[PDB]
């Protein structure tokens, strides 16, 4: 935001931060809805204490889906939850707030351990058998399974398509003052 002979030149968007906040909220909601869909596939009465994460060790889809959802919540780089935190740190550095960066770093590391602590509880002696029965047989839902498939795709490879979401969010946020 400089001036030369009464001509103003600015290289700052001034609306990037609102889009970053929107992206963080949306990404958190997506990961949360992934883990709750995983929970909603199963018998809900089994998950009461924290050690009962072992109940997610039933078959490879549920186990791996929740492992990756937890890693995404912890902010592990490849997954979707990492992008929001990375862009938050980038915007804070752009705004020249090193103290905010330090406090977010402390919060991020403590929360990351808080999340990955439950990966130890997933270990179970045998298969959990956490599925509802209907017509004498376990009830496996296909629609929630497909929803989890789509959410898993966008959790694994959402970093490749993040540019379009950023474009759309900045387009929305550009209307704030106009």
């Amino acid at each position: 935001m400089s001036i030369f002979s009464n001509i103003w030149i600015n290289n700052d968007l001034n609306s990037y931060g609102l889009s970053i906040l929107l992206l963080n909220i949306i990404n958190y909601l997506i990961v949360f809805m992934l883990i709750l869909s995983v929970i909603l596939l199963t018998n809900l009465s089994k998950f009461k204490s924290l050690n009962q994460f072992k109940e997610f060790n039933s078959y490879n889809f549920i186990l791996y889906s929740l492992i990756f959802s937890l890693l995404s919540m912890a902010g592990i780089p490849p997954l979707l939850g990492f992008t929001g935190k990375f862009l938050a740190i980038l915007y804070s550095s752009f705004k020249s707030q090193y103290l905010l960066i330090l406090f977010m770093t402390i919060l991020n590391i403590f929360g990351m351990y808080f999340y990955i602590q439950n990966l130890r509880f997933v270990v179970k002696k045998n298969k959990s058998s956490i599925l509802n029965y209907k017509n004498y047989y376990v009830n496996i839902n296909y629609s929630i399974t497909l929803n989890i498939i789509l959410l898993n795709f966008f959790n694994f490879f959402g970093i490749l398509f993040l540019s379009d979401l950023i474009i759309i969010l900045n387009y929305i946020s550009s209307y704030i003052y106009i």
Partner: protein, 101 residues
């Protein structure tokens, strides 16, 4: 590459992954395979148009946001800086020349 083919490929692999995740055999409910490709091809095809059309309006929005930033900066000047020689000429341009209404 084509977005229509990319979407069709996306639906084909999505259905097969859903069959594996549900532990149901592939080759089961075959009519869902063409339906998934058709739905996914149209979905990503429209998104390709929408993302391009959002760039156009975003670029035109920044032209108006260009004007807002300059006027916000002048109005946010600390008192006594308005008539300072660093900002006096630019401030007078908006107060006098831009009084054209």
């Amino acid at each position: 590459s084509s977005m229509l083919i990319w979407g069709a490929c996306f639906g084909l692999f999505t259905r097969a992954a859903a069959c594996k995740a549900s532990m149901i055999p592939l080759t089961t409910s075959p009519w869902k395979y063409p339906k998934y490709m058709i739905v996914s091809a149209v979905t990503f095809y429209y998104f390709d148009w929408y993302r391009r059309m959002a760039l156009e309006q975003l670029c035109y929005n920044e032209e108006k946001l260009e004007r807002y930033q300059i006027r916000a900066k002048l109005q946010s000047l600390k008192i006594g800086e308005e008539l300072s020689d660093a900002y006096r000429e630019s401030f007078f341009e908006h107060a006098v020349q831009k009084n054209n209404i």
